[PDB]
Amino acid sequence: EVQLVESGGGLEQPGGSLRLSCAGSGFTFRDYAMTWVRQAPGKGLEWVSSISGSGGNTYYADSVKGRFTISRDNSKNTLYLQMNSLRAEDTAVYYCAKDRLSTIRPRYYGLDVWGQGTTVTVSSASTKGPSVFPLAPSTAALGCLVKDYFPEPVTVSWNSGALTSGVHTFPAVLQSSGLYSLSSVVTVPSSSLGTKTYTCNVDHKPSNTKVDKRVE
Amino acid sequence: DIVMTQSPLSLPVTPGEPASISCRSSQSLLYSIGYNYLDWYLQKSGQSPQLLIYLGSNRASGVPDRFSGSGSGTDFTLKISRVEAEDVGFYYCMQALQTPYTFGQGTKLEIKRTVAAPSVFIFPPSDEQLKSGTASVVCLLNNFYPREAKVQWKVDNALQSGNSQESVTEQDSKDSTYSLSSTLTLSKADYEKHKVYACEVTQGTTSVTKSFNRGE
């Protein structure tokens, strides 16, 4: 499978800078223009930038011209986005996508493959890793409460991703403290509460907080 | 900039019924005969956008029979011949005729189903959290329909206001229901000044209350 894996997102001050990366595998990277598309929290999609296969040409949205600089390293199958003079409006998930074939006239197959994205938050506040607290009670519910973290995002899985059915991981809410709090729950057979362990796997990359909490 | 406008923004559909999402562009997207530079994308909740259709009517790799695109120049239609529950999500059009690529505002496909009352669960604060100085009490509404439900916290039967936040998942891809989490946040001191903690969930004129006694 063609795959794109983005990295490099996190928190930075207004005015500050960060670089994003996107590693491609499964295709001839240098053959294709490569594109960045972003999504501000609860908004639609917005195109940011593209760069032809060879790197002959670059293309930018009006609002990012000059302060953002796209690049690629074809020898490492890697796209880059240098994001300088950061603004509140640049807070978004940033996706990379494979774009047109760079034949004398390029051939276009859509934005056929997209990365999983990387979240960028532009704020004057500081990083804070979450606490993880258990949510203890023919069906039982259990959960974890991931409280008091900044910035977004956090990921939650259960039993290292084995447990998928019945899981609800909720949109975080921003408290008045300016910190996020999220819950993740699962419904499980009540019968097996003594014969089976349930562990929430919490990751908050911006703080390098990776926690596994057994819920009893 | 080419302006793309989508109709409707919200599409409630019964599984098995057709759906049709329309896109108008402010400039013609017909580059050459058979080459209309319009794409359709689907973004499911908590996932990346995925390509459905490119160049107006070409179905991308691994996309079901059920999806098709048509149109020319300034008017385009994505069609779903028979909607399934797993189709829930946001649909965007995008032109790739010119940079910047530009997106429609998004259409949220919502699945219509029968009413389902929530399984309700209440979670007291963990002893681990209490040790910090704060109590979060959590109320889970599991798998309900429709979206509209009212959560009312009650502390020793006094109705709480302004000290709770809630959030809701997107419709489930299998059962088309929502879930909701509500958090009541008290100081440890306030939490310990009261006995009965109650979450009352109302749908229509029916109200279901789960509670616990801090003491017991």
Author numbering:
A (entry chain A): 1 to 102, 104 to 138, 146 to 224
B (entry chain B): 1 to 216
Sentences from the paper on this structure:
By engineering a small secondary structural element from the rabbit light chain constant domain into the human kappa light chain, we dramatically improved the crystallization of human Fabs and Fab:antigen complexes. Alignment of a human Fab structure onto a rabbit Fab showed that the longer FG loop present in human Kappa constant domains forms a bent and bulging conformation that would interfere with a beta sheet packing interaction. In the case of the FG loop, this consisted in replacing the septamer human sequence HQGLSSP (positions 198 to 204 according to Kabat numbering) between the structurally homologous T and V (position 197 and 205 respectively, according to Kabat numbering), with the pentamer rabbit sequence QGTTS (positions 199 to 203 according to Kabat numbering). The resulting mutant is shorter by two residues, with deletions of histidine at position 198 and proline at position 205, and is referred to here as ΔQGTTSΔ (positions 198 to 204 according to Kabat numbering).
Separately to the crystal packing analysis we have observed that the C-terminal interchain disulfide is rarely ordered in Fab structures (in only 20% of the Fab structures in our internal database). This could be due to conformational heterogeneity or to heterogeneous oxidation. Neither the K126A mutation nor any of the disulfide variants (not shown) produced significantly more conditions with crystals. Nor did the disulfide removal (C127A + GEP*) or the conversation of the interchain disulfide to an intra-heavy chain disulfide between Cys127 and Y229C (ESKC + GEP*, Kabat numbering) appear to impact crystal packing or diffraction. All structures derived from Fabs with the ΔQGTTSΔ FG loop on the other hand packed forming a beta sheet between the G strand of the kappa constant domain and the G strand of the constant heavy 1 (CH1) domain. At the time this suggested to us that the K126A mutation and disulfide removal might have an advantage, but subsequent results with dupilumab Fab indicated that the simplest ΔQGTTSΔ version was as good as the more complicated versions.
